[PDB]
């Protein structure tokens, strides 16, 4: 429980309740390699919410790609998680989601956005701890970031997510 409690504190420390989340991934080179080697294919981010008692969500990233992006792109997905107040929320989840890889020189951020596929299993009320992740398989070419550029600085990158609150 001592370590279990530390995990709760860490999660609380990262949570946000306004639909905006900035995910800092440090030790980039090491994690990048664990992905290339297949030892650790993906990483889940801490959870964040649309409001104090809104939808619970997180992100999932494949530093060496998933599906159509395997081995060639950084794949980034959105995840709807089972939240404590799901019974009070409207389903399926239907908020626009914006995903970004921040340029640490504020020159040119990588950005993409999508509206949920209402008929998809990914956006129905969660029965399990998490629904299947959905998003961008070809979010960013491995050469784009990683290599040089200004996305990786001091061995860390920043991923940003913005969940539109229209209707909430």
């Amino acid at each position: 429980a001592m370590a279990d409690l530390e995990q709760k504190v860490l999660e609380m420390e990262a949570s946000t309740y306004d639909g905006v989340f900035i995910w800092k991934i440090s030790d980039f080179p090491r994690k990048r390699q664990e992905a290339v080697a297949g030892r650790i294919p993906a990483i889940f981010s801490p959870a964040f919410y649309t409001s104090r008692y809104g939808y619970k969500m997180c992100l999932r990233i494949y530093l060496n790609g998933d599906g159509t992006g395997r081995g060639t792109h950084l794949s980034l997905f959105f995840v709807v998680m089972k939240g404590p107040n799901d019974a009070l929320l409207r389903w399926p989840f239907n908020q626009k989601v914006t995903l970004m890889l921040l340029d640490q020189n504020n020159r040119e951020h990588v950005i993409d956005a999508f509206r949920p596929d209402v008929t998809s299993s990914s956006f129905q009320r969660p029965v399990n701890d998490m629904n299947i992740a959905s998003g961008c398989p070809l979010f960013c070419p491995v050469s784009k970031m990683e290599a040089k550029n200004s996305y990786v600085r001091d061995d860390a990158i920043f991923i940003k997510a913005i969940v539109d609150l229209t209707g909430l």
Binding site: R60, G67, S75, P116, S120, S121, I132, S134, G135
Partner: peptide, 5 residues
């Protein structure tokens, strides 16, 4: 959106 594989 496209689901992860």
């Amino acid at each position: 959106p496209i689901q992860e594989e």
